[PDB]
Design a protein around this nucleic acid. Structure first.
Length: 51
DNA sequence: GTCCCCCGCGTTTTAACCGCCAAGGGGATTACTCCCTAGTCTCCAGGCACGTGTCAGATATATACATCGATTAACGATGCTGGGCATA
């Protein structure tokens, strides 16, 4: 139960940013890159995606 | 040394996944023009360093006033003690 709790905490912040990059460009479709940078900002960047 | 909260396991219940097809929002491309920027000149007044200046606090400092602490000179009353005078 706690563990999901934290998942929730991690999940928001990312989307927070995601949303921001989607919106600084005036775009309706949220890019996956958009997620990457987000992860990059917290230092959890994902290889495999979106060079 | 004790107790009860997880794992293993069989069966019961829900919804993830795959396949298929639809439809339109939104992202991607393109063309044109026009505002906004880098680049370039002149100028200084903004900014940097520093001498000069009277005002916050802080520190005594000469001068004066009020209050004792303690000491010393002066005054009231002797106490035996010493130096002599009338009686056994």
């Amino acid at each position: 139960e706690e563990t999901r709790g934290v998942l929730k905490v991690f999940l928001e912040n990312v989307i927070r940013d995601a949303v921001t990059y989607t919106e600084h460009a005036k775009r309706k479709t949220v890019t996956a890159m958009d997620v990457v940078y987000a992860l990059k900002r917290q230092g959890r960047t994902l290889y495999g995606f979106g060079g």
